[PDB]
Every structure is written in structure tokens, then in C-alpha cells.
Amino acid sequence: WTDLSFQQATQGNTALIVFPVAVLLAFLVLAALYESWTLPLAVILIVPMTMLSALFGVWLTGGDNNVFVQVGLVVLMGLACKNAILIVEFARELEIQGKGIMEAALEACRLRLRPIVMTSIAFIAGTIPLILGHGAGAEVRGVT
């Protein structure tokens, strides 16, 4: 192999190292900050749901798992955790304040729904120019 084909063959399973390590690093950080082994599990369990949703868009458009798709997965991993952290952290504090498990979870979602929808839509509105890209470089931007 030569030229780009040499690079394509030479590179290893670069998705297979960074993806589990980053998930492991995120899990350890959450456990350290929030002092629990099962609470971070409630956050990182949504990461598999992120890949399914992301790979569904590329599959509906007939795309392939290129580099520009993978960098989108890395970004989505951080943002998926951010949404989960907002719900979980407040429900953890409400339980400390003497609320029940169901009551704290239900109350935390009510008071944190607005920031979650505000931030989720704000990021989604930022990807509209990528979806509706035009001109030079619109192919790679549309892929991501």
C-alpha cells in the first residue's frame, strides 16, 4: 500500500482504544466527585444510547464510519454525560435533604428540565449550519 492507502492500513484500531479508555476515565472521575460506585453507572449507561442514535443518522444517509464520524462520537460522549450529570447530581442532593428515592428523582427532573432542554436545543441549533452546509468543504461538515 502507498499514499493514503498506506496510512489507512498502518493505523490501528484507533477507535478501540480511545473509546473504552475515555469511558473508563469518565466513570472514575464521576465516582471520585460524587462518592459512589453505582451513581456514575447511571450516567455512563446512556453512552451506548448515544452511539445508536448517532450511527442511525449516518446509516440513514448512507454514510460510512470515517474519521469525521468518529470525532462526532467523541464529542457526543462528553455532551451525553453532561445531560445525565444535571439530573443525577440534583437528585443526589435532594436525597441528602431527606427526600425519598422516587420523590428526589421526580423533583430533580422537574427543576432541571429547563436547563437541559435549553442546552440541548442550543447545541442542536449550532449544528444546523453543518446540516445545511454549502460550498467548499460542505461534504466533511455534513458528515460530522
Binding site: V29, A32, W37
Partner: protein
Amino acid sequence: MDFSRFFIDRPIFAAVLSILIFITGLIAIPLLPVSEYPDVVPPSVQVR
């Protein structure tokens, strides 16, 4: 100082800190060059 007394109440924070050091060392083990001695052999250039 209360540095050590801060970790007695947080076993998981203490455990996570030790785990992070350990796993990082495992990653770097196959990345290190293997040789008998450090770079102590003088480089030589031969003209024939």
C-alpha cells in the same frame, strides 16, 4: 493539615486516585523501549 483526614471520609475518592495511577502505568509498560543499559554507549562514525 487536614489532607489525610479528608480522604478517610471518602474511601471511593481515595480508591479512584490509586486506580488512576495504576491503570496509567499499565498503559505505559508496553510503550517503553527495552535495552540492557541506558544510553551510555558513545556514538561512533566509521570512515572506510
